[PDB]
């Protein structure tokens, strides 16, 4: 029921152009629902999402920047986004062609349905 | 001579809207040139930059994403941008209100002068 609500949200992200896949990860935990395309190791993305959350939140605590919102990793052949929404981490893998500004605005509008 | 050229690059970053400061960090872990304000702990930013590079490079190769370009941490009261330009990491601390789109675009334009 709750996992089926997570799935229909990861499907809504598919309309956004540039997205290969996405995943709902528990805070400092494992993957709850996935859409990643298969050439992606899910346990690798999960370990990356918890390592960034731990890195970003500790440094945000000492730099007086407040609470962690989201992280972006731009590589030459793809991008890695990690959104902290409520109790979850939303990892998203994109193309290199994707424009970060439109991409970030499109994800933030669709991920508001994950606030409850 | 070279620290003069480095400092002049960081000063041109001040023209972009929302930039608090920036620093040139060697991938080894030492700050070469810095325009960061007094409230920022520079030893922390250098440790943050080298670890994020370590994680973003280790993940990009295992996920076949190519070479690491830049990493962005969006927080409640600020942003942390880390750009990999050649042998060096360019840390940038900005305001939360700064638009990520026009800031990422102007930054890459001003940081092209770092390739020689
Ligand atoms: Zn795909
Ligand atoms: Zn770490
Ligand atoms: Zn791709
Ligand atoms: Zn609730
Ligand atoms: Zn300032
Ligand atoms: Zn680590
Ligand atoms: Zn600020
Ligand atoms: Zn040269």
Residue numbers in the entry:
A (entry chain D), B (entry chain A): 0 to 115
Pull text from the paper.
Asgard archaea roadblock, longin and TRAPPC3 domain-containing proteins form dimers similar to those found in the eukaryotic TRAPP and Ragulator complexes.
Both proteins are homodimers formed from protomers comprised of 5-stranded β-sheets sandwiched between a single α-helix (formed between strands 2 and 3) and a pair of α-helices (formed from the N- and C-termini). We compared the structural similarities of Thor-RB and MKD1-RB with MglBs and eukaryotic RB proteins. Both proteins displayed approximately similar levels of homology with the RB proteins M. xanthus MglB and H. Sapiens LAMTOR2, matching ~110 residues with an RMSD of 1.5–1.6 Å. Lower levels of homology were seen in comparison with longin domains (86–94 residues, RMSD of 2.5-3.0 Å) and profilins (96–102 residues, RMSD of 1.7–2.7 Å). Despite the similarity in structures, Thor-RB and MKD1-RB display different surface charge distributions. MKD1-RB has a basic patch on the same face as observed for MglB, which in the case of MglB, is used to recruit the MglA/MglB complex to membranes. Thus, we hypothesize that MKD1-RB may be a membrane-interacting module, whereas Thor-RB, which lacks the basic patch, may be a scaffold protein for protein:protein interactions.
